[PDB]
Design a protein around this ligand. Structure first.
Ligand SMILES: O=c1cc(-c2ccc(Br)cc2)oc2ccccc12
Ligand SMILES: [Zn+2]
Lengths: 47, 161
């Protein structure tokens, strides 16, 4: 695992081409996230 | 120390988590290659993950971040999809769960789009798809994602494609 850039606690990847995309994020210490909900699903074939 | 508590579909907490899952699906630039072709999900179950030690580990770090950032943890709820989902819920996130080759370096990645995290459920690039059918677009097999509480604190902004 790398480190956060100096003076920061995470990285934000801002979408900069595809205008529909939401942001993605990176943390560099496991203790900065808690796996709160476990969701069981299937993807659905479009009709 | 982990126990899983099922939420009823009538429960408003079920309903708000399902809505965040469904409403953040988008189309992807691989045309469905990694995660499959779909506009929505069939949600089979939502479970609350309870582990006191893992929660206290999280809140302890949250407080540290918040004290480094004018009492602002900058906490978000975000998706994570992983082959290691079963180890994460029992032992928590650690370096074994990092995307070593990710575009922002070796760290643990999270998405606002549920469909982006769905691309990593069977591995990087969707791996070889579901264990049973080898199909990255399998409509039969049951998948699991995490909806996670994430402390960002002061986040470095990277503009990117
Ligand atoms: O949910 C994610 C899981 C992962 C992930 C999980 C396990 C492994 Br091994 C590699 C990547 O990568 C992402 C990259 C960008 C946005 C979201 C994710
Ligand atoms: Zn399958």
């Amino acid at each position: 695992m790398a480190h956060s850039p100096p003076g920061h606690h995470s990285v934000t990847g801002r979408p900069s081409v595809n205008g529909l995309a939401l942001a993605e994020y990176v943390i560099y210490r496991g203790e900065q996230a808690y796996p709160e909900y476990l969701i069981t699903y299937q993807i659905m074939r479009p009709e | 120390g982990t126990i899983l508590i099922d939420l009823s579909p009538d429960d408003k907490e079920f309903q708000s988590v399902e809505e965040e899952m469904q409403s953040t699906v988008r189309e992807h630039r691989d045309g469905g290659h990694a995660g499959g072709i779909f506009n929505r999900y069939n949600i089979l179950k939502i479970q609350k993950v309870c582990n006191k030690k893992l929660w206290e580990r999280y809140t302890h770090r949250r407080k540290e971040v918040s004290e480094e950032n004018h009492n602002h943890a900058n906490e978000r709820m975000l998706f994570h999809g992983s082959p290691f989902v079963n180890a994460i819920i029992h032992k928590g996130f650690d370096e074994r769960h990092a995307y070593i080759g990710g575009m922002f370096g070796a760290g643990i990645y999270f998405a606002e789009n549920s469909s982006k995290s769905n691309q990593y459920v069977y591995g990087i690039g969707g791996g070889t798809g579901c264990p049973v059918h080898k199909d990255r677009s399998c409509y039969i097999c049951h998948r699991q994602l995490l909806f996670c509480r994430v402390t960002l604190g002061k986040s470095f902004l990277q503009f990117s494609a």
